[PDB]
Symmetry: D2
Subunit: 343 residues, 4 copies
Amino acid sequence: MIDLRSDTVTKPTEEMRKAMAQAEVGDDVYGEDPTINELERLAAETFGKEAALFVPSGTMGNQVSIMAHTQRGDEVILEADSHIFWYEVGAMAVLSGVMPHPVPGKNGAMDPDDVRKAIRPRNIHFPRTSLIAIENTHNRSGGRVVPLENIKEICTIAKEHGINVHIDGARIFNASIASGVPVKEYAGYADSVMFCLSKGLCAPVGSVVVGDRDFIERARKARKMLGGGMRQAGVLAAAGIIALTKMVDRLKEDHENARFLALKLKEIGYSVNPEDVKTNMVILRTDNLKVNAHGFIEALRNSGVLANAVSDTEIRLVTHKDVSRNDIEEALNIFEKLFRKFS
Amino acid sequence: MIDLRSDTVTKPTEEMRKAMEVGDDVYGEDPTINELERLAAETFGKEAALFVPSGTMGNQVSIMAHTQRGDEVILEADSHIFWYEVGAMAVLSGVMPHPVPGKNGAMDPDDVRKAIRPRNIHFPRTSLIAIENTHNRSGGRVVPLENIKEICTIAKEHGINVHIDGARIFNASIASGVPVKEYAGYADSVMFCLSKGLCAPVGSVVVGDRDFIERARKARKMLGGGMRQAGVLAAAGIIALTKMVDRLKEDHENARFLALKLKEIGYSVNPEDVKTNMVILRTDNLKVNAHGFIEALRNSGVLANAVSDTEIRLVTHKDVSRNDIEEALNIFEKLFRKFS
Amino acid sequence: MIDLRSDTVTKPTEEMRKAMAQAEVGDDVYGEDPTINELERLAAETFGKEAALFVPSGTMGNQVSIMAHTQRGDEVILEADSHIFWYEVGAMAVLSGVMPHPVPGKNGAMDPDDVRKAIRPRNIHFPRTSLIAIENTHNRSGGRVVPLENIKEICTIAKEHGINVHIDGARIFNASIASGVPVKEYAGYADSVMFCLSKGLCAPVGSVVVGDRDFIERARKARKMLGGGMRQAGVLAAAGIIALTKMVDRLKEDHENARFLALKLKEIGYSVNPEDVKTNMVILRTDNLKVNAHGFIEALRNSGVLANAVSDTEIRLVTHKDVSRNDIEEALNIFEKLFRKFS
Amino acid sequence: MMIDLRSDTVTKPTEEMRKAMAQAEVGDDVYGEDPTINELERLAAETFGKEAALFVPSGTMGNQVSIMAHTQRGDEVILEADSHIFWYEVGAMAVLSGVMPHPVPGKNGAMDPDDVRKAIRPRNIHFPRTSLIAIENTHNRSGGRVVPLENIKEICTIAKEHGINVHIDGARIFNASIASGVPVKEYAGYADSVMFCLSKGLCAPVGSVVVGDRDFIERARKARKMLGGGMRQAGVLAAAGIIALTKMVDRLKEDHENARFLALKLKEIGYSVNPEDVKTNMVILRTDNLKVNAHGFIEALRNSGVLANAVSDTEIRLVTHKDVSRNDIEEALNIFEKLFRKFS
Ligand SMILES: [Ca+2]
Ligand SMILES: [Ca+2]
Ligand SMILES: [Ca+2]
Ligand SMILES: [Ca+2]
Ligand SMILES: [Ca+2]
Ligand SMILES: [Ca+2]
Ligand code: NA
Ligand code: NA
């Protein structure tokens, strides 16, 4: 089918499948897997950091980072619509015993003044603000790119207060492709960065956390506690190396396809705003249709297109490697036919 | 000094000092604690009650008794549980707060409904909604009974518990005319303070169903609130609950007078917003910010707390007489000349 | 009834009642209660430490100490039969996220070599051992006194590893009166000590934690989090000062009464060991009786004597200010009658 | 290269596994759409006679999500005093679940049922609630010892009477089964949940599986999401797991035969080992009759081409697995014989 549900559904490339088959492995618990070691070395190098740690998921990447940055009772400033707050099962409270301090943002960009104001003064009644998290290409807002200046401004505030900064860069390469800002530049204004290998980059499993050597050592211990300490994970790391080193540039194609899809959907008559499409996500409202988002998703599935409803009136369409321009053209033919039925 | 920092500074009345029969509460044998809890449960129309050393403990054992690890707790964005309880909900219960904006403590029921998490693997389970009555941060504002009723209805629909942080619920009752028993009927649990406007030296009480209170009592033991001959404290608590409620009206009168007169001097206050024992004073029209003005106030005989860089909270209580208020106003008058 | 269940049942003396009624108080949250401040000053001085913190209970005292000494995932070495492990509702795991590491002891004295062996090596699989707790006048062994030499040897081991030492001194003054070792000497070989005011010292409520200034500041914030931050607690502190300054010497009376009780129980024929009784507790075994401990407790209760069973064959008898020699004599007459019935 | 007797975790994928992983049919497991993971879980559930199963990236995660699903904050978990959950899982039970471990000493990994019974907390405000009893099968620390089915049966009876959950840390449960002749479904029949590893003796590169009732597995799956074990196209890993379960269990007998040979021969040389205690893939060697300690002996073995781990200042653990052949065992033995001349 034509899967526009998310970029998480990307499948391994033929190059990845071959590398997994001949991957050199070892027990990572002993630090003896050569491929995992190389993946971490490459990731550290790529983001200009001292060290890196491979994890089974972006969620674990964010959570081990929070654990490594905080102490029980601490508070973590984060954007009110960020993944760490909305889609990580309340893990920060259970695993680290910390409280989130949601700060509103405009498409992922928290006003530097609101962030500075959310920092807790030193008082017996108050938690200690020890971490500030920023999400780049903010998911909930529709894959928007957080301006480099916003990140730089918040980094300055953090520095003045002795507060750590973590960038949830699950889709940081999409941000870099859209903005022209190198990932090293983003990373320089953060103490840690988590980036996904299993979304737009097409690896089957995993993410990576990069940061200072001492922070990574603490995160590695947290990873062991959480259950992310695998054995011969080099099989996964082999695909990860290809994802990191060879699948970044083509993300531009996903952006082009998302924009083309949006422009054409608007032409048909669907409620979409092509001007809001900055990366690989398109938000489709169903207010003008005879059925709501849930009913329209079912009609789409019957015609060969998969998508998710994110509310009763909104559907999200996400492009990726496994959605070609031909697939986009085919999907548009289907959307055209469904508009005749449901407008 | 003229202490306007909080109503927590109230000292025991002579009758409280004399009242302060005991036993070991761990064995449930302190008769005065037992009578205090019996009286509290009766007053709020609940099955059981639990004495605790502080309102923070009262709120926290209630959260522990209402939730499981990983749950989410809907609460007002400027509520005490979120801002002034040291992140205890995350450490003690492993729960995540889900702040919802409110207008003077009143969360729009529709916003509360939208904050409830659907059943999905990525989401915590919303198991509790907390409402703070006479919302501190907004100036000791009274949350409308209709707001609480509506939220209770939503909670019922979804099978979610409701906890009322009633640290100053009697102040609310006195101002609104709504009996505390009526407020409590729309909640599963209520925590109310004995150590603030009611003048007891120590403690608060949590009221609710018998099974919830049993869970809260075990949580209290875990937290370290299981005392021995606490009847010494309970004796003052009974007097606070049974003899000190009516006079809260005097604190409201003094707060309103203070606010009215401060407005006349020229300070940035809103006398029409003052319905209980608190006055929010803004410093945007002064030459110094809240922290600087608090220091000046201290040097002239007046104690108050800054609640932000531009806001000061003034609180009245039994130990601040009308004469004290008049004396404070003379001081505020002099300081307006200096910093305006 | 004649209460031998625990020394927690002690009621305030007339002196304490007057002091509580006349207590000079203030708001302790602002550090303004003069009586709490004097009690803490006196407590610190008495234990030879720079700071102290009054708490509502010994459990809170131990738990805030654990919170202030550890970080999530740490391990706490403690005696296998200690109160922190058995009677504190699993608080160490919930509040501090730490693991207990039980070590056997002989009457509360953990073999120093066993303690050194229980310290975890630096390995990703292992928690960090950051605290060693020692209980003085170890309850479960029968109110036994831990030798100063034992604490001294453990202190040296702790210093070598950079590990903190906490003494659960709930009944430390009973230990001091029996051994002749000043409480400041026991405390000199520990980082922190918690002692109770509400047991043998007769105060109605509370305990105190003593230690270094930084540690106490962290313990004070932990106390706020747990809910032990009270307002005009000077009412309780007034009785606390009398407990500390005027009720220590008379503990020797409780020790004398416990010894007399044990000797006479042995004379009657009960299975007791007077040679093991050096403080205010007597362990009585029901081995030679036609009933188990629980059934014996019931028989005692029906005859006017209260006590607790500590196992299916052992019951604990505890003396205190509120059980006089006359009461011990009357209890013995009852014990004599019951021995004829169940022996 | 060196003879690695450090652990069975070092097993490398077989040629068949490598091909199945690279060519695995995958999908997004978060949506429950990876066909290979789904088949691995179906097969695992069936093998253990349970309704459901959950793939996890490690045995530690398997145990921890099970503890999370079986307990509430403040609960106590009875477990053997030398078990992996207590010693080698980074204190995770306290941090993740807020539960207290209640160690019960065991005899060769087996806790006496009456000691388990006595460890259950009475209902009292001072005591945590005992909600889970964990049993480790082929108990590692004692030397890969096999816990009898009757021990597990008796504990199950006690747990049922008290309404307590039972979890089997079956990291090496197939080793127990091969040695005892007891099908794994029989061990599992006396437990609410069982975690078993695919990445040790079964030779898969990554992961373990938890089996149990549908509702428990659903709760464990949500715990897995929270801990970060919710992967995407994990079918790549599951492909090797299916082969581990279907083709690598019977040969564990070879690992046991190799360990028995190793022990018998080490005894003949003069080392302090007990061949009579060796029934699975582990041999405990004490250094009591050597003029060196445990760590020093490990260093000497390393210098001679043999890798092992010290588990005490006087104990070393030798583990056999697919990647150590009988010829490798003979080589190690010949070296052990000589190093016996140097250190005795
Ligand atoms: Ca993927
Ligand atoms: Ca007061
Ligand atoms: Ca007492
Ligand atoms: Ca007499
Ligand atoms: Ca392996
Ligand atoms: Ca050979
Ligand atoms: Na911590
Ligand atoms: Na729970």
